[PDB]
PDB file of C-alpha atoms in Angstrom:
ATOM      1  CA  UNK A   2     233.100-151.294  39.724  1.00 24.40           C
ATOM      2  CA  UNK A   3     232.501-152.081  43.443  1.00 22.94           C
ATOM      3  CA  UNK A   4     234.306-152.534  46.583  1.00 24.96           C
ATOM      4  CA  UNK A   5     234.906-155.916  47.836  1.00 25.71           C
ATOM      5  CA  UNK A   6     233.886-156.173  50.999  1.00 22.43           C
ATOM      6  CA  UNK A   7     230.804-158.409  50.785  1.00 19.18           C
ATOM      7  CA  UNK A   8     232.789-160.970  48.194  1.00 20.58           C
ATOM      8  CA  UNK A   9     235.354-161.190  51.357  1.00 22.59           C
ATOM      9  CA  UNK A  10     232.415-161.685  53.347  1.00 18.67           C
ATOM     10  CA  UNK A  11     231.156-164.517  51.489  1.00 18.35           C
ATOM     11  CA  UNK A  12     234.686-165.890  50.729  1.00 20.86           C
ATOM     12  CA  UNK A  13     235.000-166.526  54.417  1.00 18.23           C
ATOM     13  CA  UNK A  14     231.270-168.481  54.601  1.00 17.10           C
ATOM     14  CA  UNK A  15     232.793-170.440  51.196  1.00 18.63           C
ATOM     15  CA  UNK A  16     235.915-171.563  52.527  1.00 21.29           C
ATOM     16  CA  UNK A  17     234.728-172.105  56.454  1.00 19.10           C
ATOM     17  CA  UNK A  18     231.919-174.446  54.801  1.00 18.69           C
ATOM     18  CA  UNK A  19     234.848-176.137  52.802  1.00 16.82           C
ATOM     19  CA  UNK A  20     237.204-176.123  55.737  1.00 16.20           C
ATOM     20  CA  UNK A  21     234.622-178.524  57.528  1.00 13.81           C
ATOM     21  CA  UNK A  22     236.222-181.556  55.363  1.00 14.52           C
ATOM     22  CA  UNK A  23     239.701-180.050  54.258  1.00 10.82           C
ATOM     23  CA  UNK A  24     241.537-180.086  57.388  1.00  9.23           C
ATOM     24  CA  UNK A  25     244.684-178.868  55.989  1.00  5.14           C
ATOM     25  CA  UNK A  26     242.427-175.760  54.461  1.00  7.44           C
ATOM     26  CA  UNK A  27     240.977-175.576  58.449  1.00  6.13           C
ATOM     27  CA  UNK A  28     244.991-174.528  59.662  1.00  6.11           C
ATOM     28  CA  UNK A  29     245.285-172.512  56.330  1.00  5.88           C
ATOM     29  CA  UNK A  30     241.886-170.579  56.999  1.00 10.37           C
ATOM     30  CA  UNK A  31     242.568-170.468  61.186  1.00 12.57           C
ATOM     31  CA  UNK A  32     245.473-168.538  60.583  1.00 12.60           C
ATOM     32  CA  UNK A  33     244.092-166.095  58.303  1.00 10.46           C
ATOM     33  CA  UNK A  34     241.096-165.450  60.761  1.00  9.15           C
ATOM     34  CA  UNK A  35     243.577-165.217  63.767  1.00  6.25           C
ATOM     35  CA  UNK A  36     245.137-162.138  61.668  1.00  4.77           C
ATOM     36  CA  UNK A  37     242.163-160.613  60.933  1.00  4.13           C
ATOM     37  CA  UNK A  38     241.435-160.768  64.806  1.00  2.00           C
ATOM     38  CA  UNK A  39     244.372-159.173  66.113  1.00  4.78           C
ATOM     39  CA  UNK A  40     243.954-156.162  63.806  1.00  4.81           C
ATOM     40  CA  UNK A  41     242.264-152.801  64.733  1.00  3.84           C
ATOM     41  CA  UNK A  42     238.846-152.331  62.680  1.00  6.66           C
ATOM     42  CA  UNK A  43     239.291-148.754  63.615  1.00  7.82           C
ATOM     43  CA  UNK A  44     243.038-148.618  62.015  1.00 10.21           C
ATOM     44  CA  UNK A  45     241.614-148.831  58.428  1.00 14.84           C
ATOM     45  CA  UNK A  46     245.312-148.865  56.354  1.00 13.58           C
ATOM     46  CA  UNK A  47     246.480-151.692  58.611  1.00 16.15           C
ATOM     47  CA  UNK A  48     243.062-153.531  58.004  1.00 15.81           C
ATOM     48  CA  UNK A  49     243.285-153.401  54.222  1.00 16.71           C
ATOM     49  CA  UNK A  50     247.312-154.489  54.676  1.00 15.10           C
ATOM     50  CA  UNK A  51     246.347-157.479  56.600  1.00 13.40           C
ATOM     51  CA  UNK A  52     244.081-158.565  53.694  1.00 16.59           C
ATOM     52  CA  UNK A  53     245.898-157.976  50.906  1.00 16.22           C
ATOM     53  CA  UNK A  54     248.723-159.588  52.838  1.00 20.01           C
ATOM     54  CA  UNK A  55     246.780-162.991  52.263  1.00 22.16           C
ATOM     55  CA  UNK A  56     246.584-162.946  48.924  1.00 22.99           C
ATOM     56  CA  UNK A  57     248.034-166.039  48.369  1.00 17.19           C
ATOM     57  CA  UNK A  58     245.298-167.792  50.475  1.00 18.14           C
ATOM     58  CA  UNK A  59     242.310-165.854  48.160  1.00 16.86           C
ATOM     59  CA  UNK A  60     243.774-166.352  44.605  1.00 15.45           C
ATOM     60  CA  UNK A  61     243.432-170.259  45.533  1.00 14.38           C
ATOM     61  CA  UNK A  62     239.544-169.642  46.636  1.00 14.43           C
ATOM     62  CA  UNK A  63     238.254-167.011  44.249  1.00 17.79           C
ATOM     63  CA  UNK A  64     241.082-164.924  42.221  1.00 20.22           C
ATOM     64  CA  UNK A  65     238.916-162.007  41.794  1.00 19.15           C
ATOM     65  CA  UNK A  66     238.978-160.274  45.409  1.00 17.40           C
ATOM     66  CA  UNK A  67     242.547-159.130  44.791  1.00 20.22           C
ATOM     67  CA  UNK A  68     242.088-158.801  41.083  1.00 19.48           C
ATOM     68  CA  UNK A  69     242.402-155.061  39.666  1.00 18.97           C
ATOM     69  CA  UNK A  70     243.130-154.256  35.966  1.00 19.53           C
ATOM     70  CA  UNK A  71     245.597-151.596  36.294  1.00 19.69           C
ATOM     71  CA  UNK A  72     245.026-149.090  33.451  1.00 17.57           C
ATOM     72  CA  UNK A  76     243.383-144.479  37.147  1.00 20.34           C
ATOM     73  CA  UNK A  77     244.946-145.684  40.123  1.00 16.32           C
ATOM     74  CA  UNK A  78     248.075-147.991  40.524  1.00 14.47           C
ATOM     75  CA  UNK A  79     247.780-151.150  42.574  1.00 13.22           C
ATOM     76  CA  UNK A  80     249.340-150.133  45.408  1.00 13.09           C
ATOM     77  CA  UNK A  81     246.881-146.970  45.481  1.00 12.10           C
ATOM     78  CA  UNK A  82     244.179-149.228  44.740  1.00 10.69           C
ATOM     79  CA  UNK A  83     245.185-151.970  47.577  1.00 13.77           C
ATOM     80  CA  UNK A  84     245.458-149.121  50.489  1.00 12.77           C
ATOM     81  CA  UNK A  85     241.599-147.420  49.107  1.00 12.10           C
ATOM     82  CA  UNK A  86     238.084-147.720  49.576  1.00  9.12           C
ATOM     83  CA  UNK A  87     237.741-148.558  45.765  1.00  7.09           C
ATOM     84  CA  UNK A  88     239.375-152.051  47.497  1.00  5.52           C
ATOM     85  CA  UNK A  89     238.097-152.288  50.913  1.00  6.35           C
ATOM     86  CA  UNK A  90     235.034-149.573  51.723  1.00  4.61           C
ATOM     87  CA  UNK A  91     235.827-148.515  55.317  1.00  2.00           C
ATOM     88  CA  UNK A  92     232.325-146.582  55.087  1.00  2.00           C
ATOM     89  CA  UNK A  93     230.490-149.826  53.764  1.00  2.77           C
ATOM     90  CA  UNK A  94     226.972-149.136  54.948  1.00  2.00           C
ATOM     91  CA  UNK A  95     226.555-153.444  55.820  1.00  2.00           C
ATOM     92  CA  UNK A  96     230.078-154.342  55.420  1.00  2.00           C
ATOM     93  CA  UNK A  97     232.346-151.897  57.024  1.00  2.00           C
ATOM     94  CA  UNK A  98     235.815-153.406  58.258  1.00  2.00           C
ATOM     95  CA  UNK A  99     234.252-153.774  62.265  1.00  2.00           C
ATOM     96  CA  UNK A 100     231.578-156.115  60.901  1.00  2.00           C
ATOM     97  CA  UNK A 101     234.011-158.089  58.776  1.00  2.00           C
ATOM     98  CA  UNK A 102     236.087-158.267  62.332  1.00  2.00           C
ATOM     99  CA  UNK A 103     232.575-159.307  64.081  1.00  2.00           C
ATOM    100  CA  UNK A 104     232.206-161.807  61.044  1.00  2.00           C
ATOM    101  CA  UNK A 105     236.226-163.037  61.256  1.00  2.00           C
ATOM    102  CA  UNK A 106     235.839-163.824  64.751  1.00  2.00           C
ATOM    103  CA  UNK A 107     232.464-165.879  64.450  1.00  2.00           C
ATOM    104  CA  UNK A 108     233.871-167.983  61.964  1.00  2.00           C
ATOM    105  CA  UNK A 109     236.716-168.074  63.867  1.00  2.00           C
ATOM    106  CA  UNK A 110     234.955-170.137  66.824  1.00  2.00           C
ATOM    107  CA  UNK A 111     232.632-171.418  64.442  1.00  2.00           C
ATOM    108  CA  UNK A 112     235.457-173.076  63.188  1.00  2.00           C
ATOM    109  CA  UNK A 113     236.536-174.470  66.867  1.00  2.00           C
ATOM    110  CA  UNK A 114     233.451-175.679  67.356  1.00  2.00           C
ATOM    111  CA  UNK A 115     234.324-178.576  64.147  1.00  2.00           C
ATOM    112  CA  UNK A 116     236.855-179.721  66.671  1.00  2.00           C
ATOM    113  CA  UNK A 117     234.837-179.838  70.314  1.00  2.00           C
ATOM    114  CA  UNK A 118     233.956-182.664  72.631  1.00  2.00           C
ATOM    115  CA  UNK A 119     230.001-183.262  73.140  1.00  2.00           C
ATOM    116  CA  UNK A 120     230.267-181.425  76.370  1.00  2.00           C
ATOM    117  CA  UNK A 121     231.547-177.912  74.601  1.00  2.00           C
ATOM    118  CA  UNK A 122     229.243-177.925  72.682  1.00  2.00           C
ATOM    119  CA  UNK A 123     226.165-178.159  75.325  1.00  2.00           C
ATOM    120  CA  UNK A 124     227.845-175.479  77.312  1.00  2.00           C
ATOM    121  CA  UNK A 125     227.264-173.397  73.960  1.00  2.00           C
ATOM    122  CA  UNK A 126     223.898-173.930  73.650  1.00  2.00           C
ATOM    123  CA  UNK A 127     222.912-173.899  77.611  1.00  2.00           C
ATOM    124  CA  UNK A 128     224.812-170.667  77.767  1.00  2.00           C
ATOM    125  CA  UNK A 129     222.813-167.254  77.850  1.00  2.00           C
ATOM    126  CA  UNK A 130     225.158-164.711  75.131  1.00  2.00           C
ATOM    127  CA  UNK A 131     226.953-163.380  78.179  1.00  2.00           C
ATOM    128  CA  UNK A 132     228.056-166.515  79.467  1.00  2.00           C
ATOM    129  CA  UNK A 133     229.096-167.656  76.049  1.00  2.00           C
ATOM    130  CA  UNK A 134     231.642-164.449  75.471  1.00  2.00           C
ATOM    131  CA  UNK A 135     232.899-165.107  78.885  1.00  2.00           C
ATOM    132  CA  UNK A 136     233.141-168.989  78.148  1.00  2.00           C
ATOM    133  CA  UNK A 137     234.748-168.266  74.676  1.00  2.00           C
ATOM    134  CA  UNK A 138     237.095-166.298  76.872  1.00  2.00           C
ATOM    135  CA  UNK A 139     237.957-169.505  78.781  1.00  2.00           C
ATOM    136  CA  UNK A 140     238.869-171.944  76.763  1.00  2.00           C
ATOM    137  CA  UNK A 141     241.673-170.061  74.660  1.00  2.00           C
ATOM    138  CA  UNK A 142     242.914-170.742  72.602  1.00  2.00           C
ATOM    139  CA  UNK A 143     240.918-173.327  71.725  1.00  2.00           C
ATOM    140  CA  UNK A 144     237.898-171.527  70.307  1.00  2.00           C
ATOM    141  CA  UNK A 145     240.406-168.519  69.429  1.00  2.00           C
ATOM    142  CA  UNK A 146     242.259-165.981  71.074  1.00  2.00           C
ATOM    143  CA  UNK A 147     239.376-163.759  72.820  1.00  2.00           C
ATOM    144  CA  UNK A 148     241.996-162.461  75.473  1.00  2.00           C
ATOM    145  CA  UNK A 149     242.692-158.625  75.748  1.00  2.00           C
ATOM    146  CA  UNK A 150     245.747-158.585  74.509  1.00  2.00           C
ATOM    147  CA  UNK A 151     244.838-159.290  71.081  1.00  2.00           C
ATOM    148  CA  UNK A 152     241.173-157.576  71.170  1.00  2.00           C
ATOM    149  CA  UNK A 153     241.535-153.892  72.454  1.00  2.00           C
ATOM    150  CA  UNK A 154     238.569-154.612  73.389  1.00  2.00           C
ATOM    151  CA  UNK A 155     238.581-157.964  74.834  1.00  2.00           C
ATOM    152  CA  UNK A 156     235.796-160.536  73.620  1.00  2.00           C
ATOM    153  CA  UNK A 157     233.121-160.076  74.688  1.00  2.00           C
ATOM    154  CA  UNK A 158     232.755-157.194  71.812  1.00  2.00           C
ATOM    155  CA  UNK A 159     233.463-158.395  68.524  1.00  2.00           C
ATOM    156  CA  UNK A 160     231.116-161.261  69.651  1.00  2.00           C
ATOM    157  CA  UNK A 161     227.414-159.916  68.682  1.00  2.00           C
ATOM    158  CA  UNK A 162     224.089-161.474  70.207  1.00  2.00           C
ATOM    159  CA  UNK A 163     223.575-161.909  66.603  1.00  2.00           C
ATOM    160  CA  UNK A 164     226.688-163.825  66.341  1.00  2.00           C
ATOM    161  CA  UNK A 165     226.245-165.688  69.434  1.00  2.00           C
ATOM    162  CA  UNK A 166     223.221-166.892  67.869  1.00  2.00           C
ATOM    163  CA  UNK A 167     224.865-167.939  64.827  1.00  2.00           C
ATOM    164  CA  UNK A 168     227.585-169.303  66.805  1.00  2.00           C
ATOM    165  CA  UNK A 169     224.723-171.905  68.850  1.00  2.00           C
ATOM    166  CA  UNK A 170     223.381-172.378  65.579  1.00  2.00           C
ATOM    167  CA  UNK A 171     226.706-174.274  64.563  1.00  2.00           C
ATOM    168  CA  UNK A 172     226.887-176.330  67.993  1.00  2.00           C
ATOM    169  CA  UNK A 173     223.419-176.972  67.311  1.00  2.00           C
ATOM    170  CA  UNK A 174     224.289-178.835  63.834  1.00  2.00           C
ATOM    171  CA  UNK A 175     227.488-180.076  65.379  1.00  2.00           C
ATOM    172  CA  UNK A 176     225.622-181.444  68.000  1.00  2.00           C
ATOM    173  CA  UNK A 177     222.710-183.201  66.842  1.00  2.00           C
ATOM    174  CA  UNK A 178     224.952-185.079  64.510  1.00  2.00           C
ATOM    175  CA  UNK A 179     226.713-186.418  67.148  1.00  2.00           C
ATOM    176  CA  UNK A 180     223.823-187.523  68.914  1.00  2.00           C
ATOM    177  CA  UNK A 181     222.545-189.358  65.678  1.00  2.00           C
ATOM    178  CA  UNK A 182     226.028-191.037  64.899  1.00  2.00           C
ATOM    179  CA  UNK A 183     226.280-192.273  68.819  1.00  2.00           C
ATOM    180  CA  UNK A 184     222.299-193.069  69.627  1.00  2.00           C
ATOM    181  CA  UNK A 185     221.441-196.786  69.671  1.00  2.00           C
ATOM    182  CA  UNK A 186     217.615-195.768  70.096  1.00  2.00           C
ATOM    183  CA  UNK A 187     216.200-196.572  66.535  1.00  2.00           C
ATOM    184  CA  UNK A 188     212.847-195.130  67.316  1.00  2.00           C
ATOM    185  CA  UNK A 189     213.721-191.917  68.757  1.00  2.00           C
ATOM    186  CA  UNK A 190     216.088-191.277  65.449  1.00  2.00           C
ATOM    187  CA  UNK A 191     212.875-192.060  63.770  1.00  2.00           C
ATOM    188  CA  UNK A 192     210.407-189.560  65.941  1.00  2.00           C
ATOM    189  CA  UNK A 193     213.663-186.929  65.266  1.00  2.00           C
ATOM    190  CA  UNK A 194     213.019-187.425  61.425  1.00  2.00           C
ATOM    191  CA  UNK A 195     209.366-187.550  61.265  1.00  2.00           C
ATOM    192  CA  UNK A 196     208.673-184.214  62.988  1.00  2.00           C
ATOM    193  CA  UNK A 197     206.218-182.487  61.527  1.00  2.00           C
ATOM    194  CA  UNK A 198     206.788-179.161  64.022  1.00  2.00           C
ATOM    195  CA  UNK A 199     209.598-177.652  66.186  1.00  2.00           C
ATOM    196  CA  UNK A 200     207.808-178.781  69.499  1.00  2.00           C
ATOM    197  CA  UNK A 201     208.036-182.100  68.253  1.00  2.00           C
ATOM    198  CA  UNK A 202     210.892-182.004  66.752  1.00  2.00           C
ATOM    199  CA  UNK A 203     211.847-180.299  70.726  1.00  2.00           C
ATOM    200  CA  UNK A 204     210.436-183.297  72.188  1.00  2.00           C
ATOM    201  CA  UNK A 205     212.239-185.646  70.295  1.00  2.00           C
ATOM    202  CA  UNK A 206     215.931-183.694  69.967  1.00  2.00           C
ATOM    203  CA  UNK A 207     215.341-183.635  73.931  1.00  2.00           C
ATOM    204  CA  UNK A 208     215.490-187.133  74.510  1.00  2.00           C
ATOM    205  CA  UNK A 209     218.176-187.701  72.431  1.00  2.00           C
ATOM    206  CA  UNK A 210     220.290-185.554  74.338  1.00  2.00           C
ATOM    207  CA  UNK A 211     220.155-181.989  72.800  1.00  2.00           C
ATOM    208  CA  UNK A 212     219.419-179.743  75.370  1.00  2.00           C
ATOM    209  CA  UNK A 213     216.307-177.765  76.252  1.00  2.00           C
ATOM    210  CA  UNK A 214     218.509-174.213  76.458  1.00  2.00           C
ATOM    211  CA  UNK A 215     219.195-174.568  73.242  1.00  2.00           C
ATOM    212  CA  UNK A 216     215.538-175.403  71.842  1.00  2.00           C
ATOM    213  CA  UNK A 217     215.682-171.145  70.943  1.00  2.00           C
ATOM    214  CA  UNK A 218     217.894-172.381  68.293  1.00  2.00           C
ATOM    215  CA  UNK A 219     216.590-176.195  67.425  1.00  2.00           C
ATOM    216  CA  UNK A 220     216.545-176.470  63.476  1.00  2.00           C
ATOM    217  CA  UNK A 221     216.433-179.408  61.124  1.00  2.00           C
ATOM    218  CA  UNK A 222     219.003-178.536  58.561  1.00  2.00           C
ATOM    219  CA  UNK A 223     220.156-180.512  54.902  1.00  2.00           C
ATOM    220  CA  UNK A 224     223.003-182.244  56.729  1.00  2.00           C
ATOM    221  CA  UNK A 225     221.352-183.292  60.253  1.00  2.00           C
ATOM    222  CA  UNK A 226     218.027-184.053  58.033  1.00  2.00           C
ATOM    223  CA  UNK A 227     220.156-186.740  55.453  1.00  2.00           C
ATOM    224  CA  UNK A 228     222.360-187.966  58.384  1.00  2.00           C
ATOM    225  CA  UNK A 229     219.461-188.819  59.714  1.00  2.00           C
ATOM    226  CA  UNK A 230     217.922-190.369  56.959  1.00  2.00           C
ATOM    227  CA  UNK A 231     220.872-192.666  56.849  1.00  2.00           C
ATOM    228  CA  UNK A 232     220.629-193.653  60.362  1.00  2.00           C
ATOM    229  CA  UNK A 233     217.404-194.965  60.505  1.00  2.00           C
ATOM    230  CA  UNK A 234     217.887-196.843  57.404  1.00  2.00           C
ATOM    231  CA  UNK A 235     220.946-198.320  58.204  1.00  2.00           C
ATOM    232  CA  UNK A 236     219.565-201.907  59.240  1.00  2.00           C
TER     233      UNK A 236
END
């Protein structure tokens, strides 16, 4: 078959995307991330034990990432081997699954921030972010260096960061469309034809130019939009 690293990779996009309206799931799905944080990448056995030990939280998303039709190995060989978890996974080795954990991790924070959090995301170069992340524990997670060996900083890519503004971005602009009493400028938002204008108008509705690297009219900003403007 095929080690399961990328399934648990996409498992954690699934149930993050799900957690944004579940909030009971959010606590479920916090706590599983916050386990996955404190463990060593490098100490592959205790990696795959952490996992495995939350298999009650993946049978109730997707049953198959701790399925294994004994018949070969055991399942307790199986559950402490690469044919499980790939340590040597050329795009999903266990330090990018940390990297991933902890991005969701904030990313998941971020659901719960006040308007001014989430500009100091996106006016913050990556450097300032890690050290911001690493002030505001644990709201956006525990990024001290008692639980990151490490300290974070690290497990916190640029890539991530980006994906991380790309969240407050979202985040963000729908506050700005469920709070704006300026009819035309939601209008100007949803008629941009181009990111410059859609810069100009995002601008004067209160997203800020830092983040402009980042500006991006997705599905959900795009119909809360649409609802906006037509809403008398």
């Amino acid at each position: 078959p095929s080690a399961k690293n990328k399934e648990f990779f996409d498992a954690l996009e699934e149930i993050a995307e799900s957690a944004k309206n579940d909030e009971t799931l959010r606590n479920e799905l916090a706590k599983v991330l916050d386990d996955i944080l404190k463990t060593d990448p490098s100490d592959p056995e205790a990696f795959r034990k952490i996992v495995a030990e939350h298999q009650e939280f993946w049978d109730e998303h997707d049953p198959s990432l701790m399925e294994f039709n004994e018949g070969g190995k055991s399942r307790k060989q199986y559950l402490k081997s690469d044919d499980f978890l790939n340590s040597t996974d050329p795009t999903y080795n266990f330090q990018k699954l940390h990297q991933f954990a902890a991005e969701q991790r904030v990313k998941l924070g971020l659901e719960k921030s006040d308007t001014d959090t989430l500009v100091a995301i996106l006016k913050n170069n990556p450097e300032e972010c890690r050290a911001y992340i690493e002030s505001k524990k644990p709201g956006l997670g525990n990024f001290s260096e008692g639980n990151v060996h490490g300290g974070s900083g690290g497990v916190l890519s640029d890539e991530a960061i980006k994906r991380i503004k790309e969240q407050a971005r979202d985040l963000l602009l729908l506050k700005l469309i469920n709070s704006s009493g300026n009819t035309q400028l939601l209008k100007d938002l949803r008629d941009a034809m181009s990111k410059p204008e859609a810069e100009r108008a995002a601008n004067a509705l209160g997203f800020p130019t830092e983040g402009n690297g980042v500006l991006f009219l997705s599905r959900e900003v795009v119909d809360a939009l649409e609802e906006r403007v037509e809403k008398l």
